[PDB]
Amino acid sequence: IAAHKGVNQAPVPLKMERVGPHDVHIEMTAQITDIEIDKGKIYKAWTFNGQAPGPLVVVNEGDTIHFTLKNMDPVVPHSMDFHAVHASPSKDFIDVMPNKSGTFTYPANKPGVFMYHAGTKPVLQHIANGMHGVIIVKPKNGYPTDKEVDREYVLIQNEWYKYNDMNDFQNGVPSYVVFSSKALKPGDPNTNGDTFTLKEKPLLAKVGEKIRLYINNVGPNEVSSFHVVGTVFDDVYLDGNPNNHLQGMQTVMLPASGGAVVEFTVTRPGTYPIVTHQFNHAQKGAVAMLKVTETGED
Amino acid sequence: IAAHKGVNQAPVPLKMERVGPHDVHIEMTAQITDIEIDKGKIYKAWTFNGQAPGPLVVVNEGDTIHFTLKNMDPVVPHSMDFHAVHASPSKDFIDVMPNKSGTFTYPANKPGVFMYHAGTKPVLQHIANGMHGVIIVKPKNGYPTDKEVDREYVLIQNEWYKYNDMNDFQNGVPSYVVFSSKALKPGDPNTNGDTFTLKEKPLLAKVGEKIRLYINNVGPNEVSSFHVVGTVFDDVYLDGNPNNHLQGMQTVMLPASGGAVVEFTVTRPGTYPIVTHQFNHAQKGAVAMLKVTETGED
Amino acid sequence: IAAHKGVNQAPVPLKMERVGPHDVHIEMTAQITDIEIDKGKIYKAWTFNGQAPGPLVVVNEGDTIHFTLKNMDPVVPHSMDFHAVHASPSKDFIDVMPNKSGTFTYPANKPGVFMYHAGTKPVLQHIANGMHGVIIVKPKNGYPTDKEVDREYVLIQNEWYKYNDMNDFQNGVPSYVVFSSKALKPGDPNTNGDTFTLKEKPLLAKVGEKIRLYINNVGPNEVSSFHVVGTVFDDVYLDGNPNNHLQGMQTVMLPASGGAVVEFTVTRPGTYPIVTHQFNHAQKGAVAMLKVTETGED
Ligand SMILES: O=N[O-]
Ligand SMILES: O=N[O-]
Ligand SMILES: O=N[O-]
Ligand SMILES: O=N[O-]
Ligand SMILES: O=N[O-]
Ligand SMILES: O=N[O-]
Ligand SMILES: [Cu+2]
Ligand SMILES: [Cu+2]
Ligand SMILES: [Cu+2]
Ligand SMILES: [Cu+2]
Ligand SMILES: [Cu+2]
Ligand SMILES: [Cu+2]
Ligand SMILES: [Cu+2]
Ligand SMILES: [Cu+2]
Ligand SMILES: [Cu+2]
């Protein structure tokens, strides 16, 4: 895109603040940012806030979100669709033009781990170019296993294709399939979807801990067969809804846009790969590492 | 197929009648019919009754079906396999030759949303050419959420490939992935699997309604990540069996031939896309529209 | 691989023995063996014990497995990952070098139908070349439907690609998708993943029986839409965990590495195909036959 040539906008922090007991303001940007998706390979991504996937949003069940999108792209319109909310797509997920802003208000009344993405036609183009992320809606009454959990992380799976190639997006195999992690607190890792970061800088844990991961497969096109090597999921909650509760799974099937909360134990020290078990995708990048030490540091 | 050149058989209505409290007669045809699957693109489909997917069949749990197939194809044999029934495939799903008829009897003793299709080798060829559909078996005791439901529709997802090309069927990506809707009553829309009808003529609803969709992904080859934009499914029943009950899902994973009953609320007026969230397939046709008005008309 | 040219190692029996009430010794080989995967087509497979998929392992919930792998491959290292166990992947799933042995100890504390495979980088290469199988962990308290079951079989789905072709493994469609069956007792069939054996030599049953199948889709890359023609699954237990219980399904979605216990009735005599309903894969080999007779023999 000629107007994107030499555009590289620096990442903007997510702006959030609570304005009432069940009302929250969120402000995000649409912006064009270069991300290194594999060693030596830059993708000029269409992003929220200069991250792909975008920043993590965490709200509580029953919050109303008053959301503002500032479009920094000089030519392409962008929009936001949150899977968490009930809204009118043709009134509330509409396009925000270049250098313009839009504000929208809608409720999050279901707990879970939800995809968000741009809703601008062709949606495939916006998702594939990087406009995806996750919003977590915390359940009012928690999960039944909350007392047993020691440590929490967020992981997101996405694909990358040949740059802005609609034929490849529609008809091709992914070039790369990747994990990223987003921070539930400062001090947690917060990364972009790339083939290497979570191998070189693993997630940490301590021997004996019960780990909770909040996971979402944003696609755009593939399903995921999510598995942690060396363990079995003790509990699974499909889409993060506490009522959707499975036990003792080896692997969790996730549709495109599907989420889960998964919990498992790590019993021995060592390095534990995290994969999609569709091993063509794992080979193309989708392996993250969990390093489990006798202290929880390293 | 040389004997199909210039054959275009007009659609025949489904013939059904109840002959006892738990016995029902159904008569269907196998016939060759041109269907416009995308603007300007005719597919000479192998069909039941001149529709692809075929006509909707609705029976009650515990009905015995006395089914007749009349084969109008002048050269190719066809057969019927209903997923709803218990039967002997080699005695009851057998081929009916050209210009011949066959009658078969079998029970439907499980509730749900079931695929039907031809069982004639190679089955892939018959399904891909259009010989698929859905049979709904109503549960004797209903669903637990029946009192909350305001409006019901049936949607079916299928793929189309290059015309009668067994290499493409086996090894290729779909050319088109489409939705259709079938009528649960006269006045409901009843359409074929095409890229456009349910965009140009949306399904209707009224603000505030709880909507039930009975859905099946007939394939032949792909899985589906079924999602309604702007809402969250309040309740899901896998394969339409009332015992298989999930809540608060964003997206429902359907195998090839898999079904579901899904229920959701629409809270604001506007146009609500209905997608598979495998967005390469949505881009290739699989977007239907739900128009929600302040009165339920337009 | 030049050191594999003319290597064809004969199949070795699985060596197992119980050494305490909750301790079991298993000894397996890694070996190179020619298997006929389709008529006229030999694949020089990388195998456990000269079978692909490997031999069935059955243990009880809470058993500790003391596992030895003898690597008979003259050049390539191999390793074992059992999905059933809790272990440290970097200490317990490590490579065993050529002509060397390794012993590892880990517990199986969850019931179900679990994949096993090599863990040697690149894992995709080892799985695709044939290093996969299933371990069944029996539940201490059985399944709730155990009294109703008449007959049990194990079926495994896998893919084959162009021989040892990493480009094809990562980017290509499968050449063949196949079922095999493994014996739960001597007298049961025990076969390799090929396009023909379970068509030419069907599984047997008797009219009226409730059949239990323990199934796993080992991949490496595809999902499975598992279906028995002519029946409906009465009960399904996802991953073989008795708590994960669905009823009345037509088709079961399995991720890559996913398992299930499924149970169904066969009401009439005849031949009942067993398929993945992703019919491109069924066309490429994944159809097995169940022959149901008035006596249970033939
Ligand atoms: O309360 N609206 O930003
Ligand atoms: O065992 N997981 O690759
Ligand atoms: O009762 N048979 O058509
Ligand atoms: O939010 N659905 O595309
Ligand atoms: O008890 N170890 O083989
Ligand atoms: O009805 N199964 O192909
Ligand atoms: Cu406000
Ligand atoms: Cu965008
Ligand atoms: Cu979406
Ligand atoms: Cu009759
Ligand atoms: Cu046909
Ligand atoms: Cu079928
Ligand atoms: Cu020992
Ligand atoms: Cu190996
Ligand atoms: Cu594995």
Peptide bond before A13: cis, by omega within 30 degrees of 0?
A: no
10 Å CB burial of residue A61 (0-12, 13-18, 19+) is: middle
Q: Are the C-beta atoms of residues C232 and C211 closer than 8 Å to each other?
A: no
Residues of B whose CB is below 8 A from C292: 88
CA of A178 to the centre of ligand 10 (A): 58
- What technique solved it? X-ray
10 Å CB burial of residue C20 (0-12, 13-18, 19+) is: exposed
DSSP letter at A201?
Answer: S
Extract the runs of DSSP E, i.e. beta strands, from C53-171. 57-60, 63-71, 81-82, 101-108, 112-117, 132-138, 151-160
Distance of CA B22 to the CA centre of its chain: 24
Instruction: Give residue A182's region: left, alpha or beta (phi > 0; psi -120 to 50).
Output: beta
Cβ–ligand 4 distance for B229 under 6 Å, the answer yes
Upper half-sphere CA count for residue C3 (Cβ side, 13 Å): 7
- 3-state class (DSSP) for residue B2: helix
Closest CB to A127: pick one of B270, B271, B279.
B279
Q: Which domains does chain C have, with CATH numbers?
A: 1-298 (2.60.40.420)
Instruction: Give Cβ neighbours of residue B105 (< 8 Å, ≥ 6 apart).
Output: B64, B65, B66, B67, B92
- 3-state class (DSSP) for residue C191: coil
- Distance in angstroms (rounded) separating the CA atoms of residues A52 and A67: 19
Peptide bond before A89: cis, by omega within 30 degrees of 0?
A: no
Location of structure tokens 């598979």: B276
Of A63, A57, A59, A58, give the one whose Cα is nearest residue A21.
A63
Distance from CA of B86 to the nearest CA of C (A): 5
Of B188, B216, B215, B207, give the one whose Cα is nearest residue B265.
B207
Of B59, B58, B42, give the one whose Cα is nearest residue B4.
B42
Q: Are the C-beta atoms of residues B291 and B176 closer than 8 Å to each other?
A: no
Closest CB to A221: pick one of B227, B270, B278.
B278
Distance of CA A177 to the CA centre of its chain: 13
DSSP code string of A41-107:
EEEEEEEETTBSS---EEEETTEEEEEEEEE--SS--B--EETTS---HHHHS--B-TT-EEEEEEE
- 3-state class (DSSP) for residue A281: helix
- Distance in angstroms (rounded) separating the CA atoms of residues B30 and B47: 6
- Distance in angstroms (rounded) separating the CA atoms of residues C43 and C61: 35
Mark yes or no for CB contact C219/A278 under 8 Å: yes
Q: Are the C-beta atoms of residues C76 and C27 closer than 8 Å to each other?
A: no
Q: Are the C-beta atoms of residues C89 and A229 closer than 8 Å to each other?
A: yes
Distance from CA of C291 to the nearest CA of A (A): 32
- The experimental resolution of this structure, in angstroms, equals 1.5
- Distance in angstroms (rounded) separating the CA atoms of residues A246 and A239: 12
- H or E element, residue A166: helix A166-171
CA of C196 to the centre of ligand 11 (A): 24
DSSP code string of C19-87:
EETTEEEEEEEEEEEEEEEETTEEEEEEEETTBSS---EEEETTEEEEEEEEE--SS--B--EETTS--
Q: Are the C-beta atoms of residues A84 and A259 closer than 8 Å to each other?
A: no
**Could you count the other beta carbons within 10 Å of the beta carbon of residue C249?**
26
- Distance in angstroms (rounded) separating the CA atoms of residues B23 and B91: 20
Terminal-residue alpha carbon distance, chain B: 43
- H or E element, residue B42: strand B41-48
Specify the length of chain A in residues: 298
Extract the runs of DSSP E, i.e. beta strands, from chain A. 15-20, 23-38, 41-48, 57-60, 63-71, 81-82, 101-108, 112-117, 132-138, 151-160, 176-182, 203-206, 210-219, 224-228, 233-238, 245-249, 252-254, 259-265, 270-276, 287-293
Cβ–ligand 6 distance for C272 under 6 Å, the answer no
